[PDB]
Structure formats: C-alpha cells, structure tokens
C-alpha cells in the first residue's frame, strides 16, 4: 500500500534543493499519501557536460526518475547547461522540465523530445511585439537579426505572427555574429523607407549593432527602437540608445518560484499518470539498458496538457513545442537614461500603465512612422515599342 515514486532534479544550490524537497513535502501533503508516496531527489550541476550526463545516469536515472528539473547553475552557464541532461533523460524519453532556461533551441521537438519548460523562449516575445504593433498599428518595421538558430527561430516566429495579416513584410537584415562593421547593413536599412528598427541578437552583438546604428544616427527622432531582454542586459545596456523599447519576462531570474510551479505541474502530472494501467517503471540504471522508457511519451503527453491557473507566474499552459503560453511580460521604456515600465503584457493584447511612453529623441508623444515618401529609384527594361 505505501508505495514510493522517485523524482529527479538538477538545481543551482543546496538551498534550491531544500526548496524542492519542501515543495515535494507540500505536494504529498496536498495529495493522498495512502495510494502513492512522493520522494525527492536532486543534484547540483556538475563542472562539465560529461560529468553531468554521468550524474544523470547514476544519481538520477538509476534512482528511477519520473522527471528531471533543470535550472541555471551558479555563475552564468550561457543557458546551454540543460542540453546534456535533456539528452540523457531524452534518450529514455524521460520528460525534462526547464525552469530558468529561455533558449529557443529547445523549442524544436526534433533535437529535444522530452524537453518542456516553465518559461517562454525568446522567440515568443513576438507575441508582445504583436500586441504592441496591434494597438499602435505600426505597419513598417526592419527586422535585424544575427545569423544563428536563436535569431532564426525568433525571426521565424515573428514572421509567422506577421503571416497573420496578408503580405506583411518590410526588410530582412541577417548578419554574422562578431561583425565589427555593420555600416553596410545599416546603410541598406537606411535606404529603406521604414524608420522603425527591431533588433534581435546577443548582447555582445547588440553592442556593435547599436554602435553602428549610433554611428549612422539611426537612434534619433522619427525612428523607433524595439528590442528584447538580451539587448537591454549586460554590455549592451551601457551602449543602449535613449527611447529604446524592451521586454522583461516575469520571474525570469527566479528559480524557486519556477521550482514551485514545476513542482505543482509535476504533481498534477504524476497524480494523473497513475490513474491508468499498464504503467511501467523507468530504467533502474543506464548500464545495460538500451531500450527507452515506454511510459515516457505518455507522461510527456500528460505534461503538455497540464493546466495550472494558480501558478506563481500566473496561468500555466504549454504550447505544442512545450514552451509556456500566456506568460506575463513587462514592457520597458528608456527615458532620461533610465528604464521605465509603460505597461505589461497579460493574456490577450496589452494593458498600458500610468507611466508616460517615451520615444528616442525625447519626444513626449511621437508615434511617427514610415516617414518620407520621396524620389523613387525606378528599375526599368528595354522594350522597343514602349521604351
């Protein structure tokens, strides 16, 4: 009667570990301990990828883990940390749940099948961009992206968003990361009629892009600048132009909140999973086991259908890729070399706060776009009767 089920996890510190264990205690406390009983298992991030895959194969998988949590480790891991864990657990199709990881490379069901997350990726910011362009009705924007999987995913998502309206596109500027001179691309943008620039790239790239745009005087009045969370953070924040618009996801740096949310979703999933029959136990070790865990795709199915409205980050619903939907965002404006909240993104569309919207150049209210219609270069052809 008192049967136990093990749950694996990987967190930042023993503190977060204790948080997780407390969450498990509350989980068995808020559920029946008569039928099934919960057991907490967690390990700290290993120094290297290999050692972490090993830590999964012994400290986690050998313990028969039904799920594996992943958060950002102490000191910056560049968000590539959960990958080998998503691999190892993914081999057995053991669902892996992300917490602080925003990288869009995990939105591919191809590379990581068992990988979901409690935060939306950077590509999903195109939702907030979509409500922004919705209420303000901006029909012209230049899309400046670095050449990589991330930027191309964000690009694809924004285009899909732009695919909503008929034939909506202005210019696509793709650049290779680490390029010091963007002057060519920026001039090709400057030749374009649209004065509104949307740049999605890494911080160190954003510094050079902002540097080149500042060199081209594209940060002045008449122009609008809408960026993401990576662009306002780090080395780029110093070089950020005034009037720049940005976004910040709620509980992004927060592990414990997401630890709790994940614990809740996992609770629902586990309690819902034992309601069926023919439920097989996860492998008791990596060693000697070639075959995958047969219950894994089912548990994943249950996880992606999980609805948890009471989450600390708000309503929790997962998209097809496994990314979080209906996540709350914070719109940020740059006024007088200071960040300010002009509103927040909740559910559908956007609600504007009492703070006054500021634009580059320091203009109080200036929703000016598409600018000048001027002398047009005419490409033509040679045809005897006509030309």
């Amino acid at each position: 009667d008192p049967k136990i089920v093990n749950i694996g996890a990987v967190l930042s510190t023993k503190k977060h570990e204790q948080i997780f264990r407390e969450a498990v205690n509350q989980a068995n406390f808020f559920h029946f301990t008569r039928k099934i009983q919960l057991n907490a298992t967690s390990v700290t991030h290993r120094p290297n990828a290999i050692q972490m895959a090993l830590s999964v194969c012994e400290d986690l998988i050998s313990s028969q883990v039904y799920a594996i949590l992943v958060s950002h480790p102490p000191a910056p891991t560049d968000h590539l940390t959960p990958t080998p864990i998503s691999y190892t657990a993914g081999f057995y199709r053991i669902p892996v749940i992300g917490l602080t990881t925003r990288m869009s490379i995990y939105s591919d069901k191809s590379i990581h099948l068992s990988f979901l997350r409690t935060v939306p990726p950077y590509s999903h910011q195109a939702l907030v961009w979509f409500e922004m362009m919705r209420l303000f009705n901006w029909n012209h924007v230049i899309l400046i992206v670095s050449d990589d999987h991330e930027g191309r995913a964000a690009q694809k998502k924004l285009e899909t968003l732009l695919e909503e309206k008929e034939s909506k596109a202005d210019k696509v500027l793709q650049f290779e990361p680490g390029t010091k001179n963007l002057t060519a691309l920026l001039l090709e943008a400057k030749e374009l009629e649209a004065r509104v620039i949307i740049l999605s790239a890494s911080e160190d790239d954003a510094t050079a892009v902002y540097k080149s745009a500042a060199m081209l005087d594209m940060t002045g009045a008449g122009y609008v600048w809408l960026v993401g969370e990576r662009e306002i953070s780090g080395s780029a924040l110093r070089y950020a132009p005034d009037g720049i618009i940005g976004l910040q996801l709620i509980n992004g740096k927060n592990e414990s909140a997401h630890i709790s949310d994940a614990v809740a979703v996992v609770a629902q999933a586990i309690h819902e999973l034992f309601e069926m029959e023919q439920i097989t136990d996860p492998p008791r070790g990596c060693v000697g086991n070639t075959n995958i865990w047969k219950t894994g795709p089912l548990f994943k199915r249950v996880l992606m259908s999980s609805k948890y409205p009471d989450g600390v980050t708000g309503r929790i619903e997962f998209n097809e890729d496994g990314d979080r939907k209906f996540a709350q965002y914070s719109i940020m404006n740059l006024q007088n070399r200071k960040l300010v909240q002009v509103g927040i993104f909740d559910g559908s569309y956007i609600i504007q706060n009492d703070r006054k919207i500021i634009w580059p150049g320091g203009e109080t209210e200036r929703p000016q776009g598409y600018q000048m219609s001027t002398r047009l270069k005419i490409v033509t052809i040679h045809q005897e009767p006509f030309v």
Binding site: L54, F91, G288
Partner: protein
C-alpha cells in the same frame, strides 16, 4: 620514430568478432576493446576509462546495435572533448539533423540528401511519379522533405506529390491520431522517414489502413533498416530500402579505412603545420585551435584510389550504396547498385 595512440571499441555482436583481426610514416597504436552494453553511461565511462594514461588521440567506434542514439552520443562526446570520432558500422553510422561546426564526428553512413536522391532515382527507374511522404519529427525529416521538394522544383518531367504527413512520436498513441493521419494516404509510393522502432510501430499501424498491401510500395532511407541480418516482423513485404555494402565492404575493412583517414589527416597537417592532452574534464595544453586544421584536413582524404572524404554535414561524401528489397521470405535481397554517376 613518431607514434600516435588509437582506441578501437567494438560492441558485442551475434556475429563472430575476433580482436586478433601501408602503415604510413606515422605509426598507429591499436587498442582493442570489447563492450557488452551500448548504453550511454557504459559508452561514456568506458571511453573515459580507456583514455586513462594511454593518451589516445584517435578513436574508432562501431556497433551491431539498431540504436540511432549512438551517433548522438558519439557526436556529443566528440563535440565536447574536441576529439576525432568515426562511426563505422550500425547505429554509429546512422543519421542526425544538424551538427555544430566544432564537431569532429564523422560517419561512414550516406547523407540524408543523397539517400532521398537515391530513393527518387528508384522512383524514376521504376517510373513512379505519384507518391506520398510520411516523416516523423526525428532529426533530418526537414532535410528529407526539403530534398524531395527541391528535386520536384527544377524537373521538367511529370511529378506529383499528393501528401506530406508529419507524425509526432513524442506522444503516446491512444486517440490513434497516427491512424487518422495515415488513413488519409492514397498514392502508390509512400516515403517513410523515421528510426527503426518508429518504422516498426508506423508499419504496424499501416496494416490497419492496408497501406502495406499490394499496389503500395514503400521507399525508405538507410536509417530504418540499417541491418540486413535483423529484420522486424512488422516490416511490410516489398519494402525498398538503401543499404551500405556489407558483403562487398567488410566491417574490419571499415575500421581500416578509419585508421587510414585519421593517419592521413595527421600526415597532411604534418606536411603543412610541421608539428595531445587526453582527459574528459579539461586540457591545460589548449591546442583546441590547432584541432580545427586537423578537422579540415580530415575532411579531404584520398586513399588507395578511392576517396573516403567526408561531408560538411558530418556524413561520407560518396560511399557505395546498394538498393535492397525485402522478399516474400523476409530477407533483404539486393535489387540494385548505385555508383557516383551511373545508376545500376
């Protein structure tokens, strides 16, 4: 005088594997290894244990398994430790979607693009214009689809693709969404892109729809079969596939070709650069920067009048492939031989 260490890991097979089974100026050292289980922890640990103080720069790996995961493991290790790895037989030689530019992992298996091209050549040879596409979300399906769509664009010849259906294997089958998607199939030729287990389940599902019956011929890449000896009972009779040469190309010969590739690459940078920390966790010797030149040189290899040269996607450039057909007796028979240019 100069000498380099190489580790050869072979996994337990049904067939007889004997460890006892033109050396170049650089002298190779062969470490023979036999492994029971192909699981990730076993592979990673044994490889890291075989490393030890032996200072092995090159690694030769092959398996009898049907697991396509082995190539992902090997690629992960090669990418992480910046070390050359050559997939030889079976699972290690199977296909992946996209590998990093830093990855030195190379496979003797054919590129997915060339697989799809060969398949299309099969379709042309038997003159099948009407076909269908079923792919899973397993890595490479996008490449496959995009190759068929690429070929159908510039062809002046008559071509029709009725359907492209993408099945999600990440979820358990209850609602039978797989059945509902597969029952929509019409065309006589169905291109199925998926792993062997996926191929088994999907072929099992197709029986309910009757797509494995006569009038329907399935044309599949090397990813599904991958072993001519072991044939799943759920595989439909008359299944066409593409296989790397087995009778013609021996397993020890493959390993030989791998050592040849490694040695030739090391000798190529010997003439060019004129000039090896071994462990998992880290290397104080650096040299990661010089590893790239070694990889670039490892790309192009001319040996014995035959090019073993690899591709940027990580696969082999032009390996010999034979088209096989599953007969009534449920054994793979060779229905074709496909060369560089001409098609037999």
């Amino acid at each position: 005088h100069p000498n380099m260490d190489i580790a050869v890991i072979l996994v337990g097979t049904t067939e007889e594997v004997a460890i006892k089974d033109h050396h170049l100026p650089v002298t190779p050292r062969v470490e023979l290894v036999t492994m029971q289980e192909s699981d990730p922890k076993s592979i990673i640990t044994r490889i890291c244990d075989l490393m030890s103080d032996k200072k092995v720069q090159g690694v030769v790996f092959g398996d009898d398994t049907d697991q396509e995961a082995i190539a992902q493991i090997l690629d992960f290790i090669s990418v992480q430790t910046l070390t050359p790895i050559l997939g030889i037989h079976g699972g290690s030689s199977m296909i992946m979607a996209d590998k990093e530019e830093a990855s030195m992992f190379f496979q003797f298996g054919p590129s997915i693009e060339q697989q799809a091209s060969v398949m299309l050549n099969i379709m042309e040879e038997y003159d099948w214009y009407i076909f269908s596409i079923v792919t899973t979300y397993f890595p490479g399906y996008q490449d496959f689809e995009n190759k068929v769509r690429s070929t159908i664009e510039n062809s002046f010849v008559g071509w029709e693709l009725e359907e492209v259906i993408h099945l999600d294997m990440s979820l358990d089958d209850i609602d039978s969404k797989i059945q509902n998607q597969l029952c929509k199939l019409q065309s006589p030729v169905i291109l199925l892109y998926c792993t062997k287990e996926e191929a088994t389940y999907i072929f099992e599902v197709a029986h309910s729809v009757g797509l494995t019956g006569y009038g329907f011929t399935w044309i599949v890449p090397s990813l599904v079969a991958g072993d001519t000896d072991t044939v799943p009972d759920e595989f439909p009779t008359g299944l066409i596939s593409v296989s790397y040469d087995e009778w013609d190309y021996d397993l020890p010969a493959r390993v030989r070709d791998g050592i040849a590739i490694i040695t030739t690459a090391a000798s190529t940078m010997l003439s060019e650069h004129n000039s090896s920390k071994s462990s998992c966790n880290n290397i104080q010797e650096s040299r990661v920067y010089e590893a790239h030149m070694l990889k670039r040189y490892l790309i192009n290899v001319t040996f014995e009048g035959r090019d073993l040269s690899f591709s940027e996607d990580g696969y082999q450039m032009h390996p010999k492939l034979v088209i096989i057909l599953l007969n009534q007796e449920r054994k793979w028979e060779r229905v074709g031989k496909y060369k560089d240019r001409s098609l037999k």
